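Exercise 7b. Backbone tokens:
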């Protein structure tokens, strides 16, 4: 009792499109940021979103035409809120990949 545990499995990396480009959606090793990087995934991420600034996560329902996760960010101190949609594109595993990254995130987000 009172033991606190953190996640210790491999961080999921998901084949996803963002603004119609293909790339990889993952978290940083410290599990503090959601990141998306365009293929070939040599470079830095195009999207880097602090878990601390995510205010919502939504999904297309299972059996939808597309598998999509939608992240809403805290409005920046520069003034509707920023949103990011990632379409899961693995031919067979799209929904399982979305579930996995969703399940990780919602665990990290609820713990804070
Ligand atoms: Cl589905
Ligand atoms: Cl599957
Ligand atoms: Cs994977
Ligand atoms: Cs928060
Ligand atoms: Cs689908
Ligand atoms: Cs966006
Ligand atoms: Cs793909």
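Sequence design result:
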């Amino acid at each position: 009792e009172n033991l606190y545990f953190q996640g210790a499995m491999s961080i999921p990396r998901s084949q996803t499109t963002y603004k119609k480009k293909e790339g990889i959606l993952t978290l940083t090793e410290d599990r503090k940021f959601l990141i998306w990087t365009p293929l070939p995934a040599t470079g830095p991420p195009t999207v880097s979103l602090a878990l601390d600034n995510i205010t919502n996560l939504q999904q297309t329902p299972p059996g939808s035409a597309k598998v999509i996760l939608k992240f809403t960010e805290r409005p920046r101190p520069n003034a509707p809120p920023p949103q990011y949609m990632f379409q899961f594109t693995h031919p067979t595993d799209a929904r399982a990949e979305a579930n996995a990254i969703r399940d990780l995130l919602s665990q990290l987000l609820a713990a804070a």
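Instructor comment: The pocket of cesium ion (ligand 6) is lined by residues 83-84 (CB under 6 Å). The radius of gyration is 14 Å.
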